[PDB]
């Protein structure tokens, strides 16, 4: 089972205040909403993602479901092509994933 | 659960031949044996790891088990402090992990 994914990280520091969390969650939810509405996911990543793939539109390429971090594997196992998944919270922030393809 | 890990990557090209896979696996198994027999894991990473953390002894720091790549979390299901795990195959090559600490 292989997926081609794009990803966006809305960051949170290690011990965030509740206001920091609320603000990051709000931005992540807004991004999920726009992405589901058809917005260019790569442009959203370039504009808002804090991770190292941001400048490449959040493209992660291909990989097996078992190669994903556990916090994403369960959710992505039942997704279909085109789905936007998230926001998913981790110790580093809120994550938004786009399923570009499955093969 | 959280683990403080060190990591070594023995790389493989995208679509490797069986010969390439075998050669990388051989090198990785040799490193696992050297590490289990007492070799300084950090120095092994400095000398053989292709990842960005190689110069710093392959130190990955503290991580939540649920955030690790699934194939790594699975291989570390019963790991104890000091254990060397691997080689583990991924789409980028063979991986060797050392458990520095756990909590």
């Amino acid at each position: 089972t292989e997926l081609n994914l794009s990803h966006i990280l809305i960051p949170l520091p290690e011990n965030p205040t509740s206001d920091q969390v609320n603000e990051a969650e709000s931005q992540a939810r807004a991004i999920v909403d726009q992405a589901r509405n058809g917005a260019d996911f790569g442009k959203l990543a370039i504009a808002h993602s804090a991770d190292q793939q941001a400048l490449n539109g959040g493209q992660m390429g291909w990989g097996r479901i078992q190669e994903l971090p556990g916090i994403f594997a369960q959710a992505l196992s039942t997704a279909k092509k085109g789905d936007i998944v998230g926001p998913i919270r981790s110790g580093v922030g809120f994550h938004i994933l786009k399923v570009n393809d499955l093969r | 659960t959280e683990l403080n890990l060190s990591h070594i990557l023995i790389p493989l090209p995208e679509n490797p031949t069986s010969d390439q896979v075998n050669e990388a696996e051989s090198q990785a198994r040799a490193i696992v044996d050297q590490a289990r027999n007492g070799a300084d894991f950090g120095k092994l990473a400095i000398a053989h790891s292709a990842d960005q953390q190689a110069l710093n002894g392959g130190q990955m720091g503290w991580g939540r088990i649920q955030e690790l790549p699934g194939i790594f979390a699975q291989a570390l299901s019963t790991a104890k402090k000091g254990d060397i795990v691997g080689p583990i195959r991924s789409g980028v090559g063979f991986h060797i992990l050392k458990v520095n600490d756990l909590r």
Partner: peptide, 12 residues
């Protein structure tokens, strides 16, 4: 392959 690209996101 995305194995390490994803792991890198969580490193601290």
């Amino acid at each position: 392959n995305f194995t390490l690209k994803f792991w890198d996101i969580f490193r601290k």
